[PDB]
Write a protein that binds this ligand. Structure first.
Ligand SMILES: [Mg+2]
Ligand SMILES: [Mg+2]
Ligand code: NA
Ligand code: NA
Ligand code: NI
Ligand code: NI
Ligand code: NI
Ligand code: NI
Ligand code: NI
Ligand code: NI
Ligand code: NI
Ligand code: NI
Ligand code: NI
Ligand SMILES: [Zn+2]
Length: 280
């Protein structure tokens, strides 16, 4: 049976300032990558992520308090989002989950290595079905999908309950041939089969159309570098690691160039490798 995750995306003031008129397309681009991941057969389930609503916070007073404390930021967002959800899933703009995006560096008690936060197994509880994501560039799509995995009751793959079953999406800190681990396939199947994904059964009405082009088609290497290292950053000056400018000084978060990023005439990056656009 087909599951549909009806989603509201929310961008805080920091994102509105940074992205300007490009914001909505950026969020939708991020989300399109996540949706493709949930369509991978390795998840052993049918799950379509769809957007039913986007809110942009131009005035900080109209949003939740966003802070460097990720758990508090999550709690704040989760309370705030409740007023924006119609009670009935018959309403076209009713959503099963809500994601907040911010430029703010999120932190745990430990460090600020944290890039997102969510609660486990909450997807059909309107009061708790929430994720918060630090936008450090297009790699935020992978953070988005990781946190939604938690929302679907998937643990980290290094956990003890994954030992017999199990690199992958739920790794404690990516294999595009098999993005989801056996444990993740198991844990989401169980969650759904135990009846807890019941809000996900209904089709969306007039969903907000996701971009079908690869993310690198919209955003070149220089743009990718800007998203991660600020607007003064550019591509350093292939495909496997995106190096950006910061004596010539260059830096990297160690992620591949986005899929569809041009790496020459007639060629683009697919899975960290420069290849001909016209496949043989
Ligand atoms: Mg509203
Ligand atoms: Mg890929
Ligand atoms: Na952080
Ligand atoms: Na950081
Ligand atoms: Ni704006
Ligand atoms: Ni667009
Ligand atoms: Ni404040
Ligand atoms: Ni594996
Ligand atoms: Ni629904
Ligand atoms: Ni500027
Ligand atoms: Ni500048
Ligand atoms: Ni270049
Ligand atoms: Ni490093
Ligand atoms: Zn995690």
């Amino acid at each position: 049976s087909h599951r549909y995750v009806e989603t509201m995306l929310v961008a805080d003031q920091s994102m509105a300032e940074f992205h300007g008129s490009g914001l909505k397309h950026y969020l939708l681009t991020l989300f399109s990558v996540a949706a493709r991941l949930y369509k991978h057969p390795s998840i052993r389930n049918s799950v379509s992520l769809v957007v039913v609503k986007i809110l942009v916070i131009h005035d900080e007073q109209k949003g939740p308090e966003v802070t460097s404390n990720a758990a508090l930021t999550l709690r704040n967002f989760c309370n705030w989002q409740k007023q924006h959800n119609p009670p009935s899933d018959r309403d076209a703009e009713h959503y099963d989950t809500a994601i907040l995006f911010t430029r703010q560096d999120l932190c745990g008690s430990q460090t600020c290595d944290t890039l997102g936060m969510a609660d486990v197994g909450t997807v059909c509880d309107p009061s708790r079905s929430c994720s918060v994501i630090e936008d450090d560039g297009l790699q935020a799509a992978f953070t988005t999908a990781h946190e939604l995995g938690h929302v679907f009751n998937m643990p980290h793959d290094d956990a003890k309950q994954c030992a017999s079953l199990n690199s992958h999406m739920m790794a404690s800190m990516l294999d595009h041939s098999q993005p989801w681990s056996p444990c993740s396939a198991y844990m989401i199947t169980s969650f759904l089969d135990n009846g807890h994904g019941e809000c996900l059964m209904d089709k969306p009405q007039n969903p907000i159309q996701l971009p079908g082009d690869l993310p690198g088609t919209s955003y070149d290497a220089n743009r990718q570098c800007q998203f991660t290292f600020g607007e003064d950053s550019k591509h350093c000056p292939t495909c496997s690691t995106l190096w950006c400018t910061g004596v010539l000084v260059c830096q990297t978060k160690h992620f591949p160039w986005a899929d569809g990023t041009s790496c020459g005439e007639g060629k683009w990056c697919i899975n960290g490798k420069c290849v001909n656009k016209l496949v043989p």
